[PDB]
Amino acid sequence: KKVGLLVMAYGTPYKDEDIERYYTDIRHGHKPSEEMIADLRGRYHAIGGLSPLAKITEAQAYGLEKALNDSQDEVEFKAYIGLKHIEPFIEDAVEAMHKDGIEEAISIVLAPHYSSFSVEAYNKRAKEAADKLGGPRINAINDWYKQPKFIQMWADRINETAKQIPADELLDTVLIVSAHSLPEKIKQHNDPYPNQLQETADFIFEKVVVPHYALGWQSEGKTGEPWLGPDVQDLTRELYGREKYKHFIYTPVGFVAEHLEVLYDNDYECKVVTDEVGAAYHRPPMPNSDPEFLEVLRTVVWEKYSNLEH
Ligand SMILES: [K+]
Ligand SMILES: [K+]
């Protein structure tokens, strides 16, 4: 039988007309105000609109499927995309697998780090759907930031971007390593997410020419509670105040695609700050569906299959 490959991600609106229902789902059924929707529409317009965004997630899932099936002849994987906040939902993907007669699946989230707040939610939804249908059995991957090829992918991109920088200003350059912020309360649960981001930054930093680095958070939601900090905008201001860096290199390694959180929260909002302090802004290409990144994911999934079967 084919092995199911459940590739999960947050979801992005396909059409402009989807923005309201998308953000209503994100906000637990609380429809965004007219002013909030207008703000969000303006942010999507700033980054060139919606059409490029969903294509990346598709290219990652199906590129991963092809990378797996061309690299070995023990099994055939079939990819099913399951999204948190728009169709096809996680539950749709699991239903599809069961209807197709898939008995065994491996799941992976398109984010390198584990949190009890975020990744566990995907896993719980997938498992509960499967339990209701009677299958498939789902063997979940929880994180994959420790993969050497993942770290090397980011180090290589940073080192290439660093060639943009005059030799004598490299000592005035800082690497800002970031991920999506989460509610600060995850720390009361001993959530490993903050430590996993620190480890990722450490592993990358020892492989790059940039001599200074800092960890930050971004893209925090608006709920009634504090979120992990510092936010990259505030951290940029603070680091300039203390050290007067001339170059900021932003690697939002918690993200895998050029979606709104990178094209707006970094390329607009962080560049506003670097502009305001007279420093230069740099941000390497995101992984998207680059063959090097597809090979990272292939390595992750095949290592999981191998551990289960070999
Ligand atoms: K678990
Ligand atoms: K914090």
Residue numbers in the entry: 3 to 312
From the paper:
Processing of coproporphyrinogen to heme b takes three steps in both pathways, but in the CPD pathway decarboxylation of the propionate groups to the vinyl groups is the ultimate step and is catalyzed by the enzyme coproheme decarboxylase (ChdC), which does not have an analogous enzyme in the PPD pathway. In order to understand the enzymatic mechanism of CpfCs, we combined biochemical and crystal structure analyses of CpfC from Listeria monocytogenes (LmCpfC) in its apo-form and the product-bound state with iron coproporphyrin III (coproheme). The polypeptide is folded into a monomeric protein with two ferredoxin-like domains each with a four-stranded parallel β-sheet flanked by α-helices.
Structures were solved with molecular replacement using BsCpfC, the structurally best studied representative from Firmicutes ferrochelatases, as a search model, and refined to Rfree values of 0.2013 (apo-LmCpfC) and 0.2014 (coproheme-LmCpfC); for complete data collection and refinement statistics, please see Table 1. In the apo-structure, the substrate/product binding site is occupied by solvent molecules (phosphates and glycerols). In the apo-protein, the active site (i.e., coproporphyrin III binding site) is filled with solvent molecules that are released upon binding of the macrocycle as seen in the crystal structures of apo-LmCpfC and coproheme-LmCpfC. Similarly, Arg45 (H-bond to p6) adopts a notably different conformation in the apo-structure compared to the coproheme-bound structure, even though it is hydrogen bonded to Asp41 in both cases. The H-bonding pattern changes from one H-bond in the apo-form to a bidentate binding to the guanidinium group in the holo form. CAVER calculations of the putative substrate channels in apo- and coproheme-LmCpfC show that the throughput (throughput values range from 0 to 1; the higher the value, the greater the importance of the tunnel) for the two calculated main channels in the apo-structure is higher than for the coproheme structure (apo: 0.867 and 0.799; coproheme: 0.832 and 0.757). Additionally, the bottleneck radii for channels in apo-LmCpfC are larger (2.6 and 2.3 Å) than in coproheme-LmCpfC (2.2 and 2.0 Å).
